[PDB]
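Predict structure. Chain length: 330.
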Amino acid sequence: STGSATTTPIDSLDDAYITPVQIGTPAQTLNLDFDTGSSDLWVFSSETTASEVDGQTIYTPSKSTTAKLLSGATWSISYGDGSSSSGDVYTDTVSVGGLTVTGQAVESAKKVSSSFTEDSTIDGLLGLAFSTLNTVSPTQQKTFFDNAKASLDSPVFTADLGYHAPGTYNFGFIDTTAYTGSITYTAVSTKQGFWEWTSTGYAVGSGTFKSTSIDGIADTGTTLLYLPATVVSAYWAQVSGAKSSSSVGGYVFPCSATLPSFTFGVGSARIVIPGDYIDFGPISTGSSSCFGGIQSSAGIGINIFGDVALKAAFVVFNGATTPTLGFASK
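Prediction complete.
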């Protein structure tokens, strides 16, 4: 089997992407944030504290003839941005782009943090990291991909995120029309539960490539590119007037600037992030100070190849017995 679904930016900055997901019988379609940095499929629901729902579409398990309470199971998650959610668990039928999993754990939120409430466009998350990170207790549950894998034509999914435009998540096949040149594959460590890999270096603009190993994670659920402070300083030094602002929370730059590109290495291959991908617009409405899309990972404890990086590539998440990651230009 295969599946193919379009993923759409939630706003004009590509702050996140939402993908429609069918849950239950009859189908209830929710727009979920596909997150390769976590491993829980959780949704706003009829169980979510009423004051914490503000415009989201909810899953109502009592209206699904295939929903079953997973007795005694609870979940609770905290994300790297300080947001969180928790609740109980149903199993139900879940379909993405024509690919169906029966008996998928659907984690129903009883509580969500303010950042989730305040984002009316995201109805929940669909985790695509390794199932070892799943938070369901006392019996850990599998991701949608892990459940689908054996049935797929090939045990892979691909992320093709657009810049200020829709893109695609495919399951079970590689669309050879969706990228240019070849796909370069690179090793993955699953030791921390992530799609963790090592970039071979970087360049800023038309500058020379610096060969240096940068361990980090391919994370579709993180907006920006978080890299070591040395790398980030080298980038922003090429933008007149750019500075790190403790009060804003990262590098800012004059909105009048033209940003240089940023290149990262995948083995001997190179992925080029155009400068415009690094612009996250005014820090507040009407400001001439703009927020940068490349930020320091210092004090995160891990480097994160988030959407800023991934949307410059066609990315293969290869879930073979020994997982790997592939990157192609597009």
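Summary: DSSP finds four helices and 24 strands in the chain.
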